[PDB]
């Protein structure tokens, strides 16, 4: 699998174990559901760009133990 290291605001090493075949859409929502926040509230940043709902770990250049950031959106949701 692919372990994505998400940088939490409280400095947490969130290790998301994703599957190389599933769209990041299901991963993005699952992250929100786990933290107890609605989707569109947090933006996932990868290489400066933000992961879209139609993005897959196959593109961009995602690898094992990769680093991904998460920040709150200006809208809050």
């Amino acid at each position: 699998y692919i372990k994505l290291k998400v940088i939490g605001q409280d400095s947490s090493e969130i290790h998301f174990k994703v599957k190389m075949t599933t769209h990041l859409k299901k991963l993005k929502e699952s992250y929100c559901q786990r933290q107890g926040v609605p989707m569109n509230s947090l933006r996932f940043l990868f290489e400066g760009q933000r992961i879209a709902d139609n993005h897959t770990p196959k593109e961009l250049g995602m690898e094992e133990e990769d680093v991904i950031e998460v920040y709150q959106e200006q809208t809050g949701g």
């Binding site: 400095s11 947490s12 090493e13 969130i14 290790h15 075949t21 992250y31």
Partner: peptide, 12 residues
């Protein structure tokens, strides 16, 4: 350390 591994379920 504060690393937590998350495993989800792949479903359409």
């Amino acid at each position: 350390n504060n690393r937590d591994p998350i495993v989800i379920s792949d479903s359409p």
